[PDB]
Paper text:
Here, we report a cryo‐electron microscopy study of [name] ([name])/Tamm–Horsfall protein, the most abundant protein in human urine and an archetypal ZP module‐containing molecule, in its mature homopolymeric state. Hepsin protease‐mediated cleavage of the CCS leads to dissociation of mature [name] from the CTP and triggers its incorporation into homopolymeric filaments. These protect against urinary tract infections by binding to uropathogenic E. coli (UPEC), reduce nephrolithiasis, and are involved in the regulation of water/electrolyte balance and kidney innate immunity. [name] forms a one‐start helix with an unprecedented 180‐degree twist between subunits enfolded by interdomain linkers that have completely reorganized as a result of propeptide dissociation.
Imaging of purified samples of full‐length native [name] (UMODfl) showed that the majority of filaments had a tree‐like structure, resulting from the regular alternation of ~12 nm‐long branches protruding at an angle of 50 to 60 degrees from either side of the polymeric core; other filaments instead adopted a zig‐zag shape consistent with early negative stain EM studies of [name]. In agreement with the observation that the two types of structures occasionally interconvert within individual filaments, helical reconstruction of UMODfl showed that these apparently distinct conformations in fact correspond to different views of a single type of filament with 62.5 Å axial rise and 180° twist. The map is fitted with an atomic model that consists of a complete EGF IV + ZP module (chain A; blue), the ZP‐C domain of a second molecule (chain B; teal), and the EGF IV + ZP‐N domain of a third one (chain C; magenta). Lower map resolution outside the filament core and lack of close structural homologues precluded accurate modeling of D8C. However, different ab initio prediction programs suggested that—consistent with the expected presence of multiple intramolecular disulfides —this domain adopts a compact fold with average dimensions that closely match the globular density protruding from EGF IV. Considering the previous placement of D8C, this local map at moderate resolution agrees with the dimensions of a homology model of EGF I‐III. By combining this information with the refined coordinates of EGF IV + ZP, we could assemble a complete filament model consistent with both the tree and zig‐zag views of UMODfl.
Numbering used by the authors:
A (entry chain B): 444 to 587
B (entry chain A): 292 to 587
C (entry chain C): 292 to 444
The structure:
Amino acid sequence: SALNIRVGGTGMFTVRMALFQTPSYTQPYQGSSVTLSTEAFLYVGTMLDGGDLSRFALLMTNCYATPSSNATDPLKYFIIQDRCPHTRDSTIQVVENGESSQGRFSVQMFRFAGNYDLVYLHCEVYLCDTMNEKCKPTCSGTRF
Amino acid sequence: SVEGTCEECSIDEDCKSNNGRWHCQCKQDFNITDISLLEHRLECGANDMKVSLGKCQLKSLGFDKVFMYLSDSRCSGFNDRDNRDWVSVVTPARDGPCGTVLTRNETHATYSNTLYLADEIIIRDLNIKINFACSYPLDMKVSLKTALQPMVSALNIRVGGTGMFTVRMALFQTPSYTQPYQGSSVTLSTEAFLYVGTMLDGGDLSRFALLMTNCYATPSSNATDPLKYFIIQDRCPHTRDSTIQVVENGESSQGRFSVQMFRFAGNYDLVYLHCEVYLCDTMNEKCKPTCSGTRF
Amino acid sequence: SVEGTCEECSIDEDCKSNNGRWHCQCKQDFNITDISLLEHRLECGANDMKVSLGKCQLKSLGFDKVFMYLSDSRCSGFNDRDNRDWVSVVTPARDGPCGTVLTRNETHATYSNTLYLADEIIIRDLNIKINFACSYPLDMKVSLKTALQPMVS
Ligand SMILES: *[C@@H]1O[C@H](CO)[C@@H](O[C@@H]2O[C@H](CO)[C@@H](O[C@@H]3O[C@H](CO[C@H]4O[C@H](CO)[C@@H](O)[C@H](O)[C@@H]4O)[C@@H](O)[C@H](O[C@H]4O[C@H](CO)[C@@H](O[C@@H]5O[C@H](CO)[C@@H](O)[C@H](O)[C@H]5NC(C)=O)[C@H](O)[C@@H]4O[C@@H]4O[C@H](CO)[C@@H](O[C@@H]5O[C@H](CO)[C@H](O)[C@H](O)[C@H]5O)[C@H](O)[C@H]4NC(C)=O)[C@@H]3O)[C@H](O)[C@H]2NC(C)=O)[C@H](O)[C@H]1NC(C)=O
Ligand SMILES: *[C@@H]1O[C@H](CO)[C@@H](O[C@@H]2O[C@H](CO)[C@@H](O[C@@H]3O[C@H](CO[C@H]4O[C@H](CO)[C@@H](O)[C@H](O)[C@@H]4O)[C@@H](O)[C@H](O[C@H]4O[C@H](CO)[C@@H](O[C@@H]5O[C@H](CO)[C@@H](O)[C@H](O)[C@H]5NC(C)=O)[C@H](O)[C@@H]4O[C@@H]4O[C@H](CO)[C@@H](O[C@@H]5O[C@H](CO)[C@H](O)[C@H](O)[C@H]5O)[C@H](O)[C@H]4NC(C)=O)[C@@H]3O)[C@H](O)[C@H]2NC(C)=O)[C@H](O)[C@H]1NC(C)=O
Ligand SMILES: *[C@@H]1O[C@H](CO)[C@@H](O[C@@H]2O[C@H](CO)[C@@H](O)[C@H](O)[C@H]2NC(C)=O)[C@H](O)[C@H]1NC(C)=O
Ligand SMILES: *[C@@H]1O[C@H](CO)[C@@H](O[C@@H]2O[C@H](CO)[C@@H](O)[C@H](O)[C@H]2NC(C)=O)[C@H](O)[C@H]1NC(C)=O
Ligand SMILES: *[C@@H]1O[C@H](CO)[C@@H](O)[C@H](O)[C@H]1NC(C)=O
Ligand SMILES: *[C@@H]1O[C@H](CO)[C@@H](O)[C@H](O)[C@H]1NC(C)=O
């Protein structure tokens, strides 16, 4: 004879992203703010500080910039749109996405038009199981 | 009396200090059996999952020695070593080690594993296995903390534009200031009272008030005429004429002055009305002029 | 040849009528880059202030799409809708709405606000902000138009 009692616990993985300077993705920043020029290339990468399962891959469902820290802002400049980079901008190139836990997107700096002085970066990400999904998105031009 | 005072024993474990008697024992807080069987706590970590039970509860339930096992016996329980009341075990949050499995659906993944409890190696009467699971969301919001302050080469060119507010005044008939006139000319008698008011047809800012710096009448339309009969002199009405009364001036955009009719002395048949006005900012100036008799 | 003749296109926008070819395009009048960057016009209203630029000039400067913003983004540019050549925006002549401020001195008040220009949401090379201001006199002459004809015995 055995007694079974159900127990459940809500949890949360750890996810973070870093701003690298070099094209080799070497040194993260540590200051609360940085200064840059338009010609400077903004190299950024994402990482999992925990749960680095080999079969969980990092897929950028969409990334965007915002003038303010608050993510829910109407003024969004999608840099990655629904698993693919935004076209009509040659400076947007992603070396790796979905291959492994190290997701990096490269783009050169921009400024919001208006009185907005500060620019923030936000992203949404979907962990992909390599067992079932290919997790290597492929795309081309839109409807036209 | 190996230890002189209470600090050796746990804060949760109450210490009975007495002459000739010393020990620390639980209280009603961790006392009962059934709810203790219902008692537990869980913690889902980023890379590990922990389950723990109160050692006092286990001792009260008769389990002087506590044996905690999972689906894989290589995992064994041990003391909390952070808060001594609990006893806890750890499981890496993966599939394959310690017997843990991966339950996945479209929304978010989940990890499930079982905890086995017993007083000894063998189980005689009851075999309670605690089935626990942690849910890890598969979609989550992430924000880059470090903001950016880009630099751009901007061109500044100055531009200026001369403008003009709109100002007008009206001749009302009634003391209530109700109907303006529309004809190019009017006819009146001396006994008739001439009620007039001024208005801003635009720019009705709440902090801009209307102040009559001076008002005067002229026999002709041309303002620059030597023959002026000042009705309001330097922000105040002209004295020595009881018929000159102003209900409001500087209070708001509606400036009204009341005076009964007059005629210029001479061949002058027509009389005109002109005024000068200063818009007053309520933030700084009181804009409520006050005055009395002159030098004497 | 959807439209038979020239009247559809703007008077300022010259219409090229030809057999087998039809369109309307600008001329030397609105052609150059630098002076066009120097080109503008302003209008100070009783209760509103307007700034506008020639749409042809913007098209010639490569800004196929025109984004006009002020110190407050709730204010957005739009077509003139009176003379189609211009594109203009409006600002109420007060302090607080649309980010406008009030600069005041003893002689007369002044209103200052900034206009931001760009081809898209982001700015890459040049960020030109047009600083404009209107001066409203604080003392002015007012004359009652309707004269009077009093009667006396
Ligand atoms: C992908 O996968 C994920 C998970 O991996 C899915 O998301 C998960 O879905 C489950 C199921 O909905 C979620 O669990 C549920 O949580 C409920 C509470 O959630 C809130 O409170 C939490 C408190 O900590 C909080 O953390 C959380 O964030 C929420 O805010 C919980 O109430 C649910 O329990 C009910 O359902 C259980 C399973 O059916 C049931 O267990 C069984 O119960 C019977 C009954 O005795 C027992 O015999 C069985 O032994 C036992 N175990 C089994 C079957 O295995 C519970 O008992 C409980 O049953 C319902 O619960 C109702 C309320 O929840 C009660 O409603 C009351 O009813 C009264 C009348 O009877 C009155 O009308 C009263 O007004 C009314 O409120 C019922 O009474 C009661 N039954 C009975 C008979 O009384 C459940 O555990 C889980 O949280 C969620 N994941 C996350 C992260 O949140 C996702 O959907 C999947 N997606 C896809 C696409 O597949
Ligand atoms: C209360 O507040 C009100 C306003 O709110 C005050 O009244 C206002 O005062 C200002 C200042 O005087 C007035 O603006 C001035 O208008 C001048 C023209 O005005 C007439 O023409 C207008 C044309 O439309 C017309 O509408 C108007 O009614 C008048 O008829 C204008 O010329 C003035 O510009 C000079 O000053 C600018 C500010 O210093 C300066 O801007 C800077 O310039 C430098 C130089 O390159 C640049 O680097 C800066 O980026 C730029 N911007 C800044 C500093 O912010 C202009 O460039 C310009 O500079 C002078 O201008 C002189 C003539 O104005 C030139 O003189 C020539 O010089 C030559 C030698 O160099 C020869 O000698 C030549 O013969 C000679 O003519 C200078 O050359 C030039 N500098 C250089 C280096 O070349 C100014 O904008 C405003 O109009 C007025 N308000 C109203 C409603 O009229 C009031 O006073 C306040 N009162 C109190 C009590 O506080
Ligand atoms: C656990 O519960 C028992 C319940 O019996 C507690 O014993 C009671 O202790 C209080 C102390 O003031 C007495 O007044 C009651 O008369 C006792 N109960 C009975 C039935 O006699 C006991 O103290 C609780 N704590 C522990 C550690 O056992
Ligand atoms: C804008 O300026 C250019 C200047 O090149 C104009 O092109 C000239 O057009 C005339 C038309 O008779 C020719 O004679 C010139 O030879 C042209 N210039 C050159 C350098 O070849 C153009 O027409 C102007 N207007 C527009 C709308 O572009
Ligand atoms: C973010 O903005 C939305 C709407 O723009 C608002 O409802 C929400 O409260 C804001 N949150 C923060 C933290 O600013
Ligand atoms: C008004 O009168 C002055 C002098 O009396 C004269 O210089 C001016 O030209 C006159 N203007 C009109 C419009 O009559």
